[PDB]
Design an enzyme around this catalytic site. Structure first.
Site, PDB file in Angstrom:
ATOM      1  N   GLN A 241      35.921  37.556  47.828  1.00 47.35           N
ATOM      2  CA  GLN A 241      34.813  38.074  47.648  1.00 47.35           C
ATOM      3  C   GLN A 241      34.365  39.053  48.978  1.00 47.35           C
ATOM      4  O   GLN A 241      33.555  39.666  49.107  1.00 47.35           O
ATOM      5  CB  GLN A 241      33.718  37.180  47.634  1.00 47.35           C
ATOM      6  CG  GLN A 241      33.542  36.458  46.367  1.00 47.35           C
ATOM      7  CD  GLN A 241      32.437  35.446  46.301  1.00 47.35           C
ATOM      8  OE1 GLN A 241      32.637  34.367  47.041  1.00 47.35           O
ATOM      9  NE2 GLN A 241      31.221  35.587  46.258  1.00 47.35           N
TER      10      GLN A 241
ATOM     11  N   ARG B 221      36.166  31.490  47.333  1.00 50.17           N
ATOM     12  CA  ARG B 221      36.924  30.201  47.930  1.00 50.17           C
ATOM     13  C   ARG B 221      38.138  29.580  46.641  1.00 50.17           C
ATOM     14  O   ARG B 221      39.349  29.543  46.912  1.00 50.17           O
ATOM     15  CB  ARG B 221      36.210  29.061  48.172  1.00 50.17           C
ATOM     16  CG  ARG B 221      35.464  29.280  49.693  1.00 50.17           C
ATOM     17  CD  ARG B 221      34.597  28.091  49.900  1.00 50.17           C
ATOM     18  NE  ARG B 221      33.365  28.539  50.753  1.00 50.17           N
ATOM     19  CZ  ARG B 221      32.297  27.846  50.974  1.00 50.17           C
ATOM     20  NH1 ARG B 221      32.371  26.332  50.653  1.00 50.17           N
ATOM     21  NH2 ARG B 221      31.290  28.129  51.761  1.00 50.17           N
ATOM     22  N   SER B 222      37.534  29.744  45.439  1.00 51.98           N
ATOM     23  CA  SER B 222      38.375  29.484  44.325  1.00 51.98           C
ATOM     24  C   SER B 222      39.505  30.239  44.231  1.00 51.98           C
ATOM     25  O   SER B 222      40.826  29.969  43.841  1.00 51.98           O
ATOM     26  CB  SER B 222      37.572  29.297  43.042  1.00 51.98           C
ATOM     27  OG  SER B 222      36.644  28.067  43.048  1.00 51.98           O
TER      28      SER B 222
ATOM     29  N   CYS C  80      34.039  26.607  43.548  1.00 53.56           N
ATOM     30  CA  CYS C  80      33.213  26.672  44.607  1.00 53.56           C
ATOM     31  C   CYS C  80      31.693  26.992  43.925  1.00 53.56           C
ATOM     32  O   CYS C  80      31.553  26.128  43.246  1.00 53.56           O
ATOM     33  CB  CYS C  80      33.788  27.532  45.462  1.00 53.56           C
ATOM     34  SG  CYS C  80      34.032  29.207  44.723  1.00 53.56           S
TER      35      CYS C  80
ATOM     36  N   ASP D 284      29.857  27.287  56.657  1.00 52.89           N
ATOM     37  CA  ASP D 284      29.032  27.709  56.020  1.00 52.89           C
ATOM     38  C   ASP D 284      29.098  29.329  55.831  1.00 52.89           C
ATOM     39  O   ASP D 284      28.663  29.932  55.094  1.00 52.89           O
ATOM     40  CB  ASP D 284      27.552  27.389  56.656  1.00 52.89           C
ATOM     41  CG  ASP D 284      27.042  26.208  55.820  1.00 52.89           C
ATOM     42  OD1 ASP D 284      27.592  25.261  55.413  1.00 52.89           O
ATOM     43  OD2 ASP D 284      25.767  25.948  56.358  1.00 52.89           O
TER      44      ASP D 284
END
EC number: 3.1.3.48
Length: 282
Positions: A262, A221-222, A215, A181
């Site tokens: 990010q 994440r992508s 994502c 998370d």
């Protein structure tokens, strides 16, 4: 510089935030006018994450052709990817329309439906064989065929039917279920194992349309997934693998979608994944 020793040099000097901010400063800025039209407000999950006009995927529809999705075309590596946000309640039919129209074999999902106690994307595939889904706005039917649950990821076989023509196709759903998370994984080993399973399925190969990867926003994440895949392919193709420059590859990919990677922690994790993946190759 090479990668593994540039890596230790940034760790010892603690300058990951400065490296990452340089990337942010040099990244491309292209218009995203279609994404910002008022009629598309409920088609975007986040107001600050939009596809560029020049690389956006168009739906084959005359009313409204908009979806929050981008084509990342890597010329030297000879790989293409579609990066998209997690589907919203009012875009699940558009999502499967895109998969159909672009002739994709595989869908790569890097998030859970609920994270941090909030919904990160719609439940857009069926969970039981006998309870199929019909998307009436785009005239598609989706059935769960089989499901294989492993410790770090799940693979599903799905049948997508175009109800207008009665044509059917098999879609593979690759669901990485264990990204934490908060932060990034401590080791890249399970993420790399997952990438290799997607590769082995044929979903990334030229005989199919581009893989669809998402994502929640479709940039963090992508971005890590496609950046690691392309860097490892280039290391196999070139005479000198130490010439692969991960920052240059990331800036190339950011010509096609804003914001890829990010955080500075995602940048460091991408380096780690590529360094460890290269060995396993031989």
């Amino acid at each position: 510089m090479e990668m593994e020793k540039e890596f230790e040099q940034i760790d010892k000097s603690g300058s990951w935030a400065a490296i990452y901010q340089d990337i942010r400063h040099e990244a491309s800025d292209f218009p995203s006018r279609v994404a910002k039209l008022p009629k598309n407000k409920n088609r975007n999950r986040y107001r600050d994450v939009s596809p560029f006009d020049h690389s956006r995927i168009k739906l084959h529809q005359e009313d409204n052709d908009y979806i929050n999705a981008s084509l990342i075309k890597m010329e030297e590596a000879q790989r293409s990817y579609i990066l998209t946000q997690g589907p919203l309640p009012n875009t699940v039919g558009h999502f499967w329309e895109m998969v159909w129209e672009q002739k994709s074999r595989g869908v790569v999902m890097l998030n859970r439906v609920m994270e941090k106690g909030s919904l990160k994307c719609a439940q857009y595939w069926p969970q039981k064989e006998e309870k199929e889904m019909i998307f009436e706005d785009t005239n598609l039917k989706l059935t769960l065929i089989s499901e294989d649950i492993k410790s770090y990821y799940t693979v599903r076989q799905l049948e997508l039917e175009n109800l207008t023509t009665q044509e059917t196709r098999e879609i593979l759903h690759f669901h990485y279920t264990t990204w934490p998370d908060f932060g990034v994984p401590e080791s890249p080993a399970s993420f790399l194992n997952f990438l290799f399973k997607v590769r082995e399925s044929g979903s990334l190969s030229p005989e199919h349309g581009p893989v669809v990867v998402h994502c929640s926003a479709g940039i963090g994440r992508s971005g890590t997934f496609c950046l690691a895949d392309t860097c490892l392919l280039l290391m196999d193709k070139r005479k000198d693998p130490s010439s692969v420059d991960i920052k240059k590859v990331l800036l190339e990919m950011r010509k096609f979608r804003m914001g890829l990677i990010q955080t500075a922690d995602q940048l460091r994790f991408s380096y780690l994944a590529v360094i460890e993946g290269a060995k396993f190759i031989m």
